[PDB]
Amino acid sequence: VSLMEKLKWKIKCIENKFLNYRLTTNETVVAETEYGKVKGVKRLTVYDDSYYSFEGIPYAQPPVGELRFKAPQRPTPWDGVRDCCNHKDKSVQVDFITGKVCGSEDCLYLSVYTNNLNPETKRPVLVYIHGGGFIIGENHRDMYGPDYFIKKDVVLINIQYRLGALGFLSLNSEDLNVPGNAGLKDQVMALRWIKNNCANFGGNPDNITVFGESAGAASTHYMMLTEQTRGLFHRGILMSGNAICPWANTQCQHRAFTLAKLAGYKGEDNDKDVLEFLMKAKPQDLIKLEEKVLTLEERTNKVMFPFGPTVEPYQTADCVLPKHPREMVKTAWGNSIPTMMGNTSYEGLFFTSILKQMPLLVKELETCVNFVPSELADAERTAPETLEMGAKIKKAHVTGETPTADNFMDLCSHFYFWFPMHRLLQLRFNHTSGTPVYLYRFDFDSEDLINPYRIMRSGRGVKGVSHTDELTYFFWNQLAKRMPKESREYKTIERMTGIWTQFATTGNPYSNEIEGMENVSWDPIEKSDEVYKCLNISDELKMIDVPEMGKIKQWESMFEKHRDLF
C-alpha cells in the first residue's frame, strides 16, 4: 500500500481515537455473564443515536504458550467486575495498510451492542463474523462499528477468532493434538457463549442470526455445517461466500514444515520436531512469513491462502470439519434453518489491484485452464480434457479476440463466488427439509461513502460494485461520515440494515415498512427453479432473474462427464 494511504490512514487512526473518546459517555453499566460481571459503557453515533457497548468479553482462555495451535478452552471466571469499556487487540496479522505485523495472540474476545439493555421484549440477536481470508480482520469499531444497526431494536455481536497459521495450522500426527481449524473452533465457542449469555443483554436466545461477508460467510456456513453447533442459532446469512468456495478450504498439513523452514527451523520433516519449533517461534515471525509458504504451483492452481479451514486428519473432542464441505452439506443441521445468500453485481472487480501488479494474469484467459475447478483439472493443467473445460470458461467471459482485465475480473466473480453458490444451492436441495433460501444481489454503487477495503483493492475512483462494497452500508468505519437523511447512501443503510433485521426477526426478508419494497415479491429459490430469482438492490429494489445465470450454467457444463463431482 502506498506511502500516501499510509499517512492518510495514520491520520484517520488519530482522528478515530479522538472521535471515539468524544463519542464516549460516563454512563457505565454492569451486566451478568455466566463467567462473572462485565462493565460496559454507553456510546454515541454521528447520527445522534446511542448504544450500550461491551467490548473485550473473553469467550475462551487466551490461546497462548501451550494452547497455541490448540482448540480453545473455556476462560476462567472472575469475581468482581471485569472492565469491558475498551477494545482488546486483534489477532496477529499483517496490516494491509502498513505491511507491518500487528495484533496479539491474546485475541479471543467478542463485543456486544444494543440501544437498550432492558427491552420490554427479548430481541433478535445478530452475530457478525468478519471476513479477511482467515488471515486479517477484527471486531474493532473503526472497521465494524455497530452505529447503523443500533438504530434497530436488535442485539448485535461482533466476534474475533484466530487467524492465519495461528488459527489454521494442521498436522497429521495424531499424538500432537493439532488437527486444524482452531480458528473455526474459536467461532464455535463464541456461538456457545452467545447462546448462554445473550439473554443478559436483552437478547432472545431462541432467535439468533449468524452472518458474515467473504471469509465470514464461509465461516457462517461452517457454523451451519458442523455438528458442534447444532441448534445454536436460527437464521444464517451468507454474504459473498460459503464453505465450498475454492478459497474456503485447503489441505495444508504439509505446509507446517515449509513455514518452519522459512522461520529458520533446522531438522527433519516430522510433525513433532516441526511443531516444537513453531511452538516457540515469535508469533509475528510466523505471520510475517505466511505470504511465502505457497509454492509457485499452488499459486498457479489458484490456491489463495497457505493456511485455512481443512478436513481434519483425525477426529478429536472439538473436531469441526471431519469431512470435505460438500460431504458435510449432506447431513448439515443448518440446511434446515432460514437462509439468505447473495453477492455484489461486480464481485471480481476486487482483483484490480492484483492485476495492476501482475498484468500477465490476463493471459491466463487464453485457455482459462488455470480456472478449471482443481478437482477436475490435471496437475500440469495440460490434459486435453482440461483444455476442453478451459474452453467452456473461455466462452463464458472472453468477449473479444483477446481477453481483457474486465473479462478476467468478470471470470473471478464466478470462479470465486457465483459458481460455488450455485453448487451449494443444488447440493443443499437434495438434502434439506425444505426451509427457504432467499437470494439478493447488491448493486448499489457509491463513491460518496466508502470502507477501508477499497484502499486495499485500490478501488479509488473505480466504477462498479466490488466485493466488500456492501459493508459500508452495514457498519460504521473510520472513513465514514454523517450522510444527509435523504441521500441515496443513507437510504441504502436503512434498507440494508432494515432487511437484515427483518430476516433476523422472522426468517423472511420482506417488509413493506422498508422503503422501496412496496412492489417487491421476494420468493425463495425452489429445487424446480431452472433460473434463480434475486432481489437486486440498487437505487431501486427490484426482483429479477439472476443475470449471472447463463455463465453459471456454462461453468456447470464443465461437469457434463463428471456429474458425481458437481
Residue ranges with strand state E in 458-553:
533-537, 541-545
Closest C-alpha to 514, from 533, 539, 541: 541
Beta-ladder partners of 145: 476
What span, in angstroms and rounded, lies between the C-alpha atoms of 99 and 161? 21
What span, in angstroms and rounded, lies between the C-alpha atoms of 510 and 299? 42
CB 180 within 8 A of CB 137: no
CA distances from 345 to 188, 341, 441, 451 (A): 31, 13, 6, 17
C-alpha cell at 367: 485457455
Based on the number of CB atoms within 10 Å of its own CB, is 229 exposed (0-12), middle (13-18) or buried (19 or more)?
buried
What span, in angstroms and rounded, lies between the C-alpha atoms of 91 and 84? 18
Using DSSP's 3-state secondary structure scheme, residue 77 falls into coil
Closest C-alpha to 42, from 30, 32, 34: 30
Question: Annotated active-site positions, please?
Answer: 214, 347, 467
DSSP 381: S
C-alpha cell at 315: 477426529
What span, in angstroms and rounded, lies between the C-alpha atoms of 495 and 115? 19
CA distances from 92 to 107, 181, 189, 191 (A): 8, 16, 19, 22
